[PDB]
């Protein structure tokens, strides 16, 4: 065969197999392709030329091809994996033909290597993937000036797919606006060949809208300087404007320090505003576990939705949260979603940092730039120390009401001023034993140690009253008010007391505010009982049903009555006998004490008047004004007019003054009681004033009696220490010519001691207990003397 050397000297592998599939030819080209020697294959079966994984199957194909009867070969059209002798595989192609000669069918295969072809194919595939993941549209144009290569970004921006956009001129078939933006002319003026110049144009998409595009252009020449190719990089402008707006809005909102769940909503709503028709959400990693933070209002699902999941990480370290966004596919481009994701992530990180720093500040700071007062972070550390020492404080929970009116009408700036003015009132009226704090917002706490009802009611009433004068804020009155609750118990943890006080606050505010209450009912009905007692006292003093008793005072030596004293008494069927030591404080706290004094003065004068009219006379009655808390500006008028109403007998009436009530206060009364003194009223004292000035005002005010009170005469028996000052008092009286009376004597030893010390007049249980006006005349007529 003359054509056999033609096959032999070729560079393409030649294989010839017969009807029996025995290989008849195997050139060095096939040798180098398969790694085999020609002797191994000449005259042998086609089996070894088949790869092992296909060897059981290929001979079936071989016999099927023979039995098919087709006159053409359709197999081996595509690439095939050729495994050589060592076991390594390559890509090869075949040009097999079917030959029928000498009454037998033969196969003549020419084998070529496609290694470089497959390598270039994979290269092109990886390149198209890279070009797709490029975040900016790219078009390659030629001197034929048709869109040759497209991009995924270009497809997603302008809607022209690869096949459609292929083979069309860019600046003529891409639809123009209806205006004079002559894209092709702009490109062809002086720019096409050499100018890397940019300009703004408008383009039309598949949806229908027209968008602004930058169309940066650049040519590429080969070595021969001929114009080889060209690149156009379309870039959007609405996207960049919206991204800048998103940054500005997020920073503008965040700089005002909103609450955490408001900042989350701000981020969500802004991401939505940039990308309409989407559902966004935020989770924060607390203790390694996500927690929901915010979401869009429209919680319904989105058809054909796609999700972008971004990890919110702080300035250094572990993730702090997870943002996720879902939006309908084909709505906005992938690069634009990615930009919004990056901006939102890098702002949520700052939100987390601010919240963390805020929590760190909250767990520490004690004072407050607003209100200038300690906040609860100091109240905790102070009240725990108080309660640790086993002393039981009294906690006042104060809540100012009706602040929203100012908050609305004039705003938060002036609401702060109103609250600051109230704080100033509290500061000006507090006391050194008290502690003031503000817990949250418009709720305050006052810690006191005056643990008794009498002080508690007084201080609570004063706190409630501090707001009697309306808060003035820029020439507009505002009548604020307070709801104040009291808590007090021993040994209980501060949670108990705080809870009780807050319960009282809630009760009073629900009832209507403007008031004060106790928690424990056992501590609460006492106020009601005292109010009932005060009402009873007021009604009785109005109705003139009080009583007077007459202590007798007798010379220790001669035995005659030196005088008597008027002692207030108070008996009521609904309450029983109540002593003055209890119900004079009640009169002082109710504000009816002036009328009590009026009654005692008038009744004593009248009761002396009946006896003086009768055939009996007594030296004087002492009416204990300062003991009855007579101290007021209107002292002399009543004493004078009551005396005038029954007769001019000034030498028979005497008034008592307590310890330093005439000097420290009531100067205008000390400067006027001289009128009574000149009228004829006597004067008696209990304690001497400040040294060299309280000496009966340098005996100016002609005091006549000193009353050694019971507190000393009860202990005179057991203390020569007190006996010494008793002797001094007696000597001072004797020297100054003052008379000395003793109060509260009971025993004969005490009387003898007073006699030897030379006490001039003695009163008490030893001689005669205080007795009524109906029994004083008989006793004074019958019994004389008691020495």
């Amino acid at each position: 065969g003359i054509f056999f050397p033609a096959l032999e000297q070729n560079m393409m592998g030649a294989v010839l197999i017969n009807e029996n599939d025995e290989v008849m030819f195997f050139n060095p080209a096939a040798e180098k392709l398969w790694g085999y020697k020609r002797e191994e294959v000449i005259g042998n079966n086609i089996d070894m030329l088949i790869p092992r994984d296909l060897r059981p199957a290929h001979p079936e194909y071989i016999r099927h091809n023979r039995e098919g009867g087709k006159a053409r070969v359709e197999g081996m059209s595509a690439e095939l994996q050729l495994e050589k002798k060592d076991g390594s595989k390559i890509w090869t192609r075949f040009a097999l033909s079917k030959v029928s000669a000498e009454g037998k069918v033969y196969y003549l295969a020419l084998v070529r290597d496609a290694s470089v072809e497959m390598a270039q194919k994979e290269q092109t595939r990886q390149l198209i993937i890279a070009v797709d993941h490029l975040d900016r549209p790219v078009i390659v144009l030629d001197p034929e000036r048709h869109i040759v290569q497209c991009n995924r970004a270009f497809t997603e921006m302008f809607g022209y797919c690869i096949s459609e956009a292929s083979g069309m001129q860019p600046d003529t078939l891409l639809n123009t606006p209806e205006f004079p933006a002559d894209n092709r002319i702009r490109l062809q003026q002086l720019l096409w060949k050499t100018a890397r110049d940019q300009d703004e144009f408008l383009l039309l998409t598949r949806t229908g809208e027209k968008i602004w595009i930058k169309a940066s252009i650049s040519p590429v020449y080969d070595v021969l300087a001929h114009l080889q190719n060209l690149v156009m990089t379309f870039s959007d402008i609405t996207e960049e404007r919206q991204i800048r707006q998103l940054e500005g809005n997020i920073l503008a909102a965040m700089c005002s320090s909103p609450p955490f769940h408001e900042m989350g909503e701000i981020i969500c709503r802004n991401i939505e505003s940039v990308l309409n028709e989407s559902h966004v959400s935020l989770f924060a990693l607390r203790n390694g576990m996500p927690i929901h933070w915010a979401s869009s209002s429209h919680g319904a699902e989105i058809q054909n939705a796609q999700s972008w999941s971004a990890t919110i990480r702080q300035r250094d370290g572990a993730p702090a949260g997870i943002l996720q966004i879902k939006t309908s596919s084909g709505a906005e481009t992938s690069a634009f979603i990615e930009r919004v994701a990056d901006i939102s992530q890098h702002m949520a990180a700052l939100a987390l940092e601010q919240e963390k720093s805020r929590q760190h500040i909250e767990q520490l700071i004690q004072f407050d730039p607003m209100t200038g007062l300690p906040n609860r972070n100091n109240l905790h550390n102070y009240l725990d120390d108080l309660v640790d020492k086993a002393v039981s404080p009294v906690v006042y929970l104060i809540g100012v009401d009706h602040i929203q009116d100012v908050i609305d009408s004039l705003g938060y700036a002036w609401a702060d001023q109103a609250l600051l003015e109230v704080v100033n009132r509290f500061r000006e009226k507090l006391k050194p034993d008290q502690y003031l704090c503000r817990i949250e917002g418009t709720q305050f706490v006052l810690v006191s140690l005056e643990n008794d009802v009498s002080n508690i009611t007084q201080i609570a009433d004063e706190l409630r009253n501090v707001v009697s004068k309306p808060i003035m804020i820029d020439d507009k009155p505002f009548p604020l008010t307070l709801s104040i609750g009291i808590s007090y118990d021993l040994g209980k943890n501060r949670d108990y007391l705080l809870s009780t006080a807050h319960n009282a606050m809630d009760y009073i505010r629900k009832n209507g505010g403007n008031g004060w209450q106790f928690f424990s009912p056992a501590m609460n009905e006492m106020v009601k009982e005292r109010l009932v007692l005060g009402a009873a006292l007021k009604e009785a003093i109005s109705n003139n049903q009080l009583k007077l008793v007459y202590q007798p005072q007798i010379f220790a030596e001669t035995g005659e009555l030196y005088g008597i004293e008027a002692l207030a008494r108070w008996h009521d069927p609904l309450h029983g006998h109540v002593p003055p030591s209890r119900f004079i404080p009640l009169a002082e706290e109710i504000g009816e004490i002036e009328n009590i004094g009026r009654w005692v003065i008038a009744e004593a004068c009248r009761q002396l008047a009946e006896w003086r009219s009768q055939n009996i006379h007594i030296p004087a009655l002492s009416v204990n004004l300062s003991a009855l808390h007579f101290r007021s500006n209107q002292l002399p008028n009543q004493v004078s007019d009551a005396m005038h109403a029954w007769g001019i007998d000034g030498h028979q009436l005497t008034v008592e003054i307590t310890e330093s009530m005439m000097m420290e206060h009531d100067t205008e009364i000390f400067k006027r009681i001289q009128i009574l003194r000149d009228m004829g009223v006597g004067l008696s004292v209990d304690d001497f004033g400040t040294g060299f000035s309280g000496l009966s005002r340098l005996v100016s005010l002609p005091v006549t009696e000193i009353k050694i009170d019971k507190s000393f005469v009860d202990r005179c028996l057991t203390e020569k220490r007190i006996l010494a000052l008793l002797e001094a008092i007696t000597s001072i009286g004797q020297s100054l010519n003052l008379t000395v009376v003793a109060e509260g004597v009971e025993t004969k030893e005490q009387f003898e001691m007073l006699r030897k010390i030379h006490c001039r007049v003695i009163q008490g249980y030893f001689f005669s207990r205080p007795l009524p006006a109906e029994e004083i005349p008989g006793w004074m007529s019958s019994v004389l003397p008691l020495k």
Copy 2:
């Protein structure tokens, strides 16, 4: 021949040329490839099929090859363009061989249409331009994460080229810099994830520079849903991270809201830190003008300055300010400078919104919201109120300095906390009649009504040392200091009492952190004069420059001496003859009262010892020990040791005491005096006690002698009632030998008035001025008695 008919049915193009170039081996595939028919080719020279450019050379090439005798065929490897019979052009690949048959040498050429491969070649050539133009580093990774593709941006950024960075790991080439914190694991995690993700890494370039980059990884899947490739995109974020640092710092400041002129400085400082060799200026709009807010002080030389002027606008959109930037040519990019301008203009926008809100109410609100204290308007009102009442106050201008320490160590919130702590100290030490306000920043004003320089100095010193303990916040100590300026007049302008105070404050602040000053012309030097007198008093009390002085006492009932008194006297020529009224309160203030206290009695004991050497008998001697302001800390020990210091009997020395010092503490003073009273030293007293004459009678027997102060005897012509006081004394005196000492006699009309009422002892100027030390050993010997 059957190989020609075999390849007739083959897809391989084939041509064979003989000696005469007449083709006898040509197939329908070749007919399709070229266009000439078999009848037109067979027996015809091939030269008709050759492009015309090889007409004079093709046969010449055949002859040259034949003459050279190339045994092995290696030509026609390169792909060649071809022109068909109809003029169409394609690309073909040849395969040549040499054929020897019929005693002649023939040439075989197989031909294939290389269009299906040159399509891929022109595909990848065009795709490379697209993948390389945009300057964005993208890489493609296999399933095992080996890198397979890279582009121009990647090689120009990270140094490595494709050949070096082809077929290996994508992190070994991206090894982290020397900072080993977290990037070493962050890479290994991101690069091995299996979902879309992105992080920021510190990476070291091949040449050794440091780049902060943002890396994103995303997978691409084939049809069979298997993981096919991983594309990774990097991006340089150095400028972005600088902008993020700016944003973080400005948020960290504006969440605390420092003063306006400091927020401006913060913005400008960060601008200079983010921009290179630039200038920044910010202007607000007041009444329609550009008013300067703050500008960077970095006035470095700028070459070819580029200017930008953005109009920061309010919420309503009206222009409100100008953010003007000057940049060097080529220092920063247009996009960078525009972005920085936009960020800073939003920050400045919110700052100006705050400032415009604040400015509306600054002249109306009375209180100061930063600390709850009154504001400058309130001080204006207070000073107006005082000047209307014609009372000139003191205006201490407190300046809290070294606040900058907390400013640059922790920040503005902690600076406010420190201010709160200092004002809490101020209020806890504040007195009831002291007015306090905060004018601006860290400047407070304290207005009072004192006028004695000792009191003023005391207030200033207590204000200075109320901060002596450093403000402990988070256990970190900060030694704040204070500057104080004082202003006085008989009344001066309401704002001038602040400007003048600020003169002193500025003087002290510039010339030393901690201290205080009056005004130089009059009394800032007087303070120093008093301090010099204090140093002189220290010197004199150390070196016994003082001298005791003596003044006799004579029985009123004609008789001899009762006692000799002691008084401290001082005389230094440099300072003159300072009197007791001047140097005793100074002695207390300076802190050396104990020295004079012990000296006055040590000299007393020694002097009695010396006088005893002769016929001098010393009926009594009285050191004062009461006007010297003794404390209870060391009262008894010194007076006790003075006795045994020279062996003096306790029945001639005496002690005078005052109730004010006696009742400082009701526990220890009288207990200390008990030891002395047991010793036998007399206890005189002054103006009477307050405890109902008790301890004046029993605990210490201080009525051994009781005195009459100077202020009563001279005025005795008005208080004639003092006869009662003297009779009161004389009662107990005739009881148990108790004397009274009248003092301050000048003339006979007063002497006879004081003597007509029985007073034992008379002493004063009427008898003798205080004799110097040495005269008594003659005076006593001479005058006995005086009658």
